[PDB]
Write an enzyme that holds these catalytic residues in place. Sequence first.
Site, mmCIF file in Angstrom:
data_model
loop_
_atom_site.group_PDB
_atom_site.id
_atom_site.type_symbol
_atom_site.label_atom_id
_atom_site.label_comp_id
_atom_site.label_asym_id
_atom_site.label_seq_id
_atom_site.Cartn_x
_atom_site.Cartn_y
_atom_site.Cartn_z
ATOM 1 N N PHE A 123 -5.107 -4.762 9.089
ATOM 2 C CA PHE A 123 -5.695 -5.397 9.860
ATOM 3 C C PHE A 123 -6.215 -7.018 9.267
ATOM 4 O O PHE A 123 -5.788 -7.362 7.672
ATOM 5 C CB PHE A 123 -7.464 -5.173 9.697
ATOM 6 C CG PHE A 123 -9.020 -5.711 9.717
ATOM 7 C CD1 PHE A 123 -9.129 -6.426 9.788
ATOM 8 C CD2 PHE A 123 -9.390 -5.739 11.838
ATOM 9 C CE1 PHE A 123 -10.237 -7.227 9.766
ATOM 10 C CE2 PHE A 123 -9.902 -5.762 11.561
ATOM 11 C CZ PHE A 123 -11.124 -7.217 10.971
ATOM 12 N N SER A 143 -4.319 -1.588 4.218
ATOM 13 C CA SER A 143 -4.915 -0.903 5.610
ATOM 14 C C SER A 143 -3.770 -0.051 6.407
ATOM 15 O O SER A 143 -3.558 0.802 5.984
ATOM 16 C CB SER A 143 -5.557 -2.548 6.206
ATOM 17 O OG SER A 143 -6.019 -1.995 7.698
ATOM 18 N N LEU A 144 -3.656 -0.906 7.640
ATOM 19 C CA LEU A 144 -2.177 0.137 8.773
ATOM 20 C C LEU A 144 -0.960 0.069 7.917
ATOM 21 O O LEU A 144 -0.597 1.365 7.417
ATOM 22 C CB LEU A 144 -2.684 -0.566 9.552
ATOM 23 C CG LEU A 144 -2.715 0.859 10.888
ATOM 24 C CD1 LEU A 144 -3.924 1.677 10.988
ATOM 25 C CD2 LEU A 144 -2.597 -0.430 11.848
ATOM 26 N N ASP A 169 -6.515 -0.106 0.526
ATOM 27 C CA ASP A 169 -8.022 0.469 1.033
ATOM 28 C C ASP A 169 -7.692 0.975 2.700
ATOM 29 O O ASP A 169 -7.601 0.313 3.171
ATOM 30 C CB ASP A 169 -8.745 -0.860 1.511
ATOM 31 C CG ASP A 169 -9.976 0.168 1.999
ATOM 32 O OD1 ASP A 169 -10.202 1.201 1.584
ATOM 33 O OD2 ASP A 169 -10.891 -0.515 3.078
ATOM 34 N N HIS A 171 -13.058 -3.851 2.977
ATOM 35 C CA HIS A 171 -11.679 -3.545 3.695
ATOM 36 C C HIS A 171 -11.008 -4.407 3.153
ATOM 37 O O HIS A 171 -9.863 -4.466 2.990
ATOM 38 C CB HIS A 171 -11.813 -3.909 4.941
ATOM 39 C CG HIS A 171 -10.639 -2.999 5.380
ATOM 40 N ND1 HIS A 171 -9.431 -1.923 4.905
ATOM 41 C CD2 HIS A 171 -9.425 -3.095 6.604
ATOM 42 C CE1 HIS A 171 -8.620 -1.430 5.680
ATOM 43 N NE2 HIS A 171 -8.263 -2.462 6.833
#
Length: 446
Positions: A79, A154-155, A178, A265
């Site tokens: 993200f 993230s991803l 995260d 995030h």
Amino acid sequence: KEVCYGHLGCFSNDKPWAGMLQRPLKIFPWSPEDIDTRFLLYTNENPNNYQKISATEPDTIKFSNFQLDRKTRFIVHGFIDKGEDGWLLDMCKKMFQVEKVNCICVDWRRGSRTEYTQASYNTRVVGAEIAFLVQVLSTEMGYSPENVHLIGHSLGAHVVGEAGRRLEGHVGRITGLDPAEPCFQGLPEEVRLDPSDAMFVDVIHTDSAPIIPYLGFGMSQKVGHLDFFPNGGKEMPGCQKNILSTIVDINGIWEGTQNFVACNHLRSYKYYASSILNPDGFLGYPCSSYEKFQQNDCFPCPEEGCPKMGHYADQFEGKTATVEQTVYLNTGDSGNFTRWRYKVSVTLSGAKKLSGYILVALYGNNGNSKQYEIFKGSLKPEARHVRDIDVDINVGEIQKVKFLWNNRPTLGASQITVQSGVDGKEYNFCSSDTVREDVLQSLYPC
Ligand SMILES: *[C@@H]1O[C@H](CO)[C@@H](O)[C@H](O)[C@H]1NC(C)=O
């Protein structure tokens, strides 16, 4: 069924890759060409302009400033919030300040800037791209994967996890910042980041509240050898919480059409960035739970020392002794985010029982702290109280402490012990005096 993409192998769409509760859609990952993974190399010598490297065209590496006698750290995004496009390079530059390293920023924006489920599946191909580059470096240039560190946010945490699986767990280290929850949490290890993905895996959890209904984009599930939950892992100091509302629209969030405060995030990488330069400000305390830690337990650092969250976590003695080791610590709300935990014990003295609050300030050769509340309620002479406080400064060698109380009665502390977390060192201070309310009582070494 499966789609095959040449040297990157085939990508199946049956269980557990797709058609599961967390990911029902049986579509396939996009082609490597459509994702357009780009490996942008930056080194201490070339920190401003990248040198694009390609595993299929070895000369790009041969002619680059890639040093075979230096460690390599890949940084992979997920993200990307507005204005945060340059966080990968910013991170490389901080590393450059303390070490010589081949810093490769992985840009897969063409593959991530699409519908969430598609982006999630595309992580598989980006992961294959990384694994292939690492394999070239290893088989053709004799550069062992042990020298490689994959940092994925993230991803990107699952991208790196996939790369690790492909490398059969031989990549030196994976750090998950995260890791994204939607489409991954709860699935088999083969499809997500997990401890077996690298020789050592450390994870920082910063937005682990459930995506539905809390809008927490990060995973709560433990996926590393060390799973750090700074500040509890769900709400970070300085970040606006997300409004508790209706399913998300996980895609509307991902694609920026829905309101979402990405602060929590993104804190994972913000803390990692700071830990590069200030690891001593992020000592982590292994503990069975956050409430236990908050109740003044799991202090000081255990005999194996405290793992330092972030960059220097690899120095932790028990880093791979077991998996899913829960590690806790609290951070600041801005700037460096650093904190230094101290266990403070106070034995009260005086002639009268009182009602109020007792506070302690630490004074050392590195400077002094503000006053911290240790206890509030009935204040009885001879009673002892203990509280572990997260100080915003490292006072260094503690030379004296000050006691203060509030709500012409007088009260004091006859003795105060302050233990530093890093080594369990106990400093004792003593005094035979008592003071009026709102007056500082100094206690000296004893
Ligand atoms: C924050 O970190 C930087 C880099 O290590 C350091 O120079 C600076 O003094 C730190 N600031 C505080 C308030 O600790």
